[PDB]
Amino acid sequence: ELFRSEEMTLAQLFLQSEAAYCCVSELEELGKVQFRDLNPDVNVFQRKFVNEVRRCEEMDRKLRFVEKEIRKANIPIMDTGENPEVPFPRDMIDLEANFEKIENELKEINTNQEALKRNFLELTELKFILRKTQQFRLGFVAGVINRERIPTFERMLWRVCRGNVFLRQAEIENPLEDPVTGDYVHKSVFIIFFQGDQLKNRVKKICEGFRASLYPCPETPQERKEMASGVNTRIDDLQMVLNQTEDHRQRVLQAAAKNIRVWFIKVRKMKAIYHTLNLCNIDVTQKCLIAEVWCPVTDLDSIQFALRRGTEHSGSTVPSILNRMQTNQTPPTYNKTNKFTHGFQNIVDAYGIGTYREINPAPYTVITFPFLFAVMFGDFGHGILMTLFAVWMVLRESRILSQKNENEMFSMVFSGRYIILLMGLFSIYTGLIYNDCFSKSLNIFGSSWSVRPMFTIGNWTEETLLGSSVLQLNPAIPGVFGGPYPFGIDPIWNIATNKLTFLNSFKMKMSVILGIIHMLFGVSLSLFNHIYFKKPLNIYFGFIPEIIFMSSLFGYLVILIFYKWTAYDAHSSRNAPSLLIHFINMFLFSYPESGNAMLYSGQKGIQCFLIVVAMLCVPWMLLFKPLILRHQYLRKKFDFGDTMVHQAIHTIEYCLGCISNTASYLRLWALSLAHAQLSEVLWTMVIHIGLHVRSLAGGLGLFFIFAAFATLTVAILLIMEGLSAFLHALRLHWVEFQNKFYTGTGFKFLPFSFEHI
Amino acid sequence: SQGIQQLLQAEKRAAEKVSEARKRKNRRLKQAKEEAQAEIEQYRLQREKEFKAKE
Known part of the structure; x- marks a missing residue:
């Protein structure tokens, strides 16, 4: 039962x-078991299933490769349904082979698409070159380039071939596509005329300088027509193949x-599955696989069912049944959780994982953490805004569960949300x-x-006239006072100038009382935890002297706080004693018979x-446990030094x-006061700008002023x-709660599951 | 755990038995020269009788 750490079984x-793969898979489909590592020597080449995992590692890379190609192509991955594992048979x-088929087809078809496209582009340039050159030892060359290069290109031709080159x-x-980038650019053709190979080399060197695409050309319209028929x-052939090449890529x-x-x-x-199988052991003679689980x-039955089903999903008849272990080390600690409880377990686990069978803070925490929060966070309107915020997350939950997680705050x-x-x-x-x-x-x-x-x-009537000119204080005297109050805090202290004195007396004394109560619950949980572990020494030398120490000190304080609230009142308020002074003078014996x-x-x-009774507890806690432990270890025939250090x-x-943690709950008052002050300032410095003397002139400003107020109160307070x-x-x-009882030391239980994918 | 210990003992006995079988059969392979001679002598005697009939 969830009030404590769940009972496991090794x-x-x-x-x-032949069942093993199937059994592992079914167990991971169940997700209610942790395998032990039975191979301390496990490594990339020491693992029993090197090849099987390495194949998966490469098939995953092949998946990533084809997926990247598909995502670059923006072809829709269908992402339909949910699926079982592969058979154990070699399928x-x-x-x-299907991975290799797709990969090889992509590498081939992509390379072909590129090459075919590049050839088609070059031949298009050559078609235009041949058509323009058809207008025409002496020789010539022709080519294409981005048109904006032509002015510098022609000036460089006469600069190098000193004042002498003929060209068009x-x-x-139309523009033509760049074979690498796919940029369409307004290229121009050129043709250049010269005598001999020496000039050919210069015009070529300038063409290389501008990265111009030169092509060969025939000498006459008829020979150019023969070349153009080839082109x-x-x-056409290239485009026909390229169309089908692209269509085939799209099928692939x-x-x-x-x-x-x-x-x-x-x-x-x-x-x-194979990684989990690699945690198993196989000795040199070994036929079956030895395995171990928590x-x-x-759910010992639930895993045995999954084992029997794993065999039944296989050609095997062996049900692979377990023995329960007895020579056990302390198991990992598990707790079942759900929407209203998971976050509460997580914030408990985040300080530490409970010992096996240990009392679990989380169910008590489901109330007490919200309670302590709200005692500190004591604003009615912020309570509403926090409620609304979390309601909008819970109402949208089924939508939100499908959405992005990369916004970590969200x-x-x-x-x-819960x-x-x-x-x-x-x-x-x-x-x-x-x-x-x-x-x-x-x-x-x-x-x-x-x-x-x-x-x-008649009496005090003059003060009602003084009030027209000066501040005044009501001493809450009988007949004048409106009598003992039955609700929560009286509304009047919101408007009263002295309010903080009253509000503080409450929140201080309250926080002290709550703190004592929560610490008394924590030591009470210690007893029940020590009972479940059957430890007489921890109760007798721990809990009993500890609770007596705490209770004798704490009881008087709370008792006297309640006594002041009953025994003193307005008509006895002057010369009433301080609560805090009597508590201090108790703890220090220091009352001077006076004041x-x-x-x-x-x-x-x-x-x-009460003080002497608490002081008498200390030697039991400090030393008498170590002494009886020393005698027990000497009779039962560990370090006494370390035992003294720990105890x-x-x-x-x-x-x-019992000093510091007792005082620590003052944090509640502290932050509560801060919250209240911040809220009052944030109202006072803002809202009053919209509080103009006329309906329209104030209400228009108040819209924007209130939006600034909301923004600031959210960022600071909410x-x-x-x-x-x-x-x-x-x-x-x-600490102040858990340190009485929760050891918070153990392994987190980790169920093996597909959910980690 | 007695279950695995008993299985390991049976697996060890299984590995012993196959290894002893290999050694026994390797010794039988070496006996071929001993078993061969009686057949060789019968072939000699048959050819002797055939030769005496031909004489």
Whole structure:
């Protein structure tokens, strides 16, 4: 049951080889088991299934290659359905041949598409060259280039061949495509005339300088017509082949764009299956595969069913059944989780993983973390806004689960949606009882505050006239006061100038009380944890002296806080004692028989008694456990030094913790005050700009002014002070609560599954 | 774990038995020269009788 770490079971099994693949796959389809590593020597060439995994590694690279080609081509991958693994029979070889088929067809067909296209482009240039040259020892050359190069090209011809070259240029009837980049550019043809090879070499060197495309040409219209007939044949043939080349590439890409979905599932599962098989052992004589697992005790049957089914999905008859192990090391720790509980387990696991069978913080944390958050985050309106934010994530959940995760903030807040909603709801509850949103009341409650007529009763009537000119304080005297108040916080303290004194007395004393309570729960959990582990020494030398220490110190403080709230009132307020002073003078024995009045009969005796009783607990925690342990180890025929170091550290952390951790809950008051101040300032510095003396002139400004107010209150309060309270409350759990009981040391249980793909 | 230990013992006995069978059969292959002679003597005696009949 989830109040503690789940009971596991170590098991050993005799996995028949022909069933093995099937069994592993079924177990990963179930996703409720962790295999042990039985091969400490495992490495790239030491692994028993080198080839099988290496084939998967390469098939995955082949998938990635064909997928990249398909995605560059933007051909739609269908991504339909969901699929089983490959058979154990060697059918992966036919799949590997299919990978090679697609790859080889792409490499070939792509190269051909490029080459054919390049030839077609060159022959198009040559067709235009032949058509222009048809207008025409002496010789000539012809070619094409980007037209903007021609002016510099011709000037360079006369610059090198000093004032002497004959030539003609002609712009092409359309731009032509660049064979590498696919850029269409307005090229021009040229033809150049000269005598002898010496000039041929110069005009050629300049053509090379401008990267001009030269071509051979025949000397007459008739010989040019014969060449053009060749070109016209080649270019048509090339385009006919290229059309079918491109069409075939599209079939190849489309076939693969179906297959990637299926192949990804098959390959990734297969890789994982063989990797899990590589954790098994096979000794030199060994026929079956020896394997070992941690399973939930509740699901020992579920894995045995999966083993029997794995054999039944195979030619094997051997059911591969397990034995339960007894000579066990401490198993990995597992907890089942769901939407309302997973984030709460995660924030617990994030400090540390509970010991096997250990009490689990997470179910208590499902309430107490939201509670501590809301006690700190005590605004009614922010409670609403937090609630609305998390509601919009929960309502859109089925949509959002399909979307991107690469926005990590969005991923985190969505992964927190349930925890965030709960704390938001509790923050309405706390914010309501504090009677505050943005330092504004809710008018739902009545009041204990007194109207001006109640001050006009002859007595104090002058103060109602002084009020026209000066500040005044109501001392809450009988007859004048509006009587004891039945709701949460009285609305009046929102508007009152002295309000912080009243509000602080509450939030301080409250936070102290809650802290004591939560620490008393944590030591109470320690007892139940020590009971489940059956440890008399930990109860007798730990829990008993510890709870007596804590309780004797803490009980008086809470008791006296309640006593002040009952025994003192307005007509006794002057010369009433300080609560904090009596607590300090208890802990230090230091009351000087004078100053502040004692509260009740025999209180000095109680102060002395409770402290002495707590002091008497210390030697049991500090030393008597180490001593009885030393005698037990000497009789049972470990280090006494390390035993003293550990037990002293724990005892010191508890004893000093009863100062520091007791004070630590003041964090609640602290941040609560900060939140309240921030909210009041953020209202006061902003909203009042829209509070003009006329309807229209104020209301138009108030729209934009309120949007700035919303932006700032979100960024500061709803985001950051929220994140503050969140992280503080986690700390309060991780130490001041948990350190009484939760060891938080163990392996995380890791179920093997396809879900990790 | 007794189950794997008993299996390992049977696998060891299986590996021993096949290895002893290989050694036994390799010794039988060397016996061919001993078993051959009685057939060789019968062929000699048959050809002797054939030659005496031809004489």
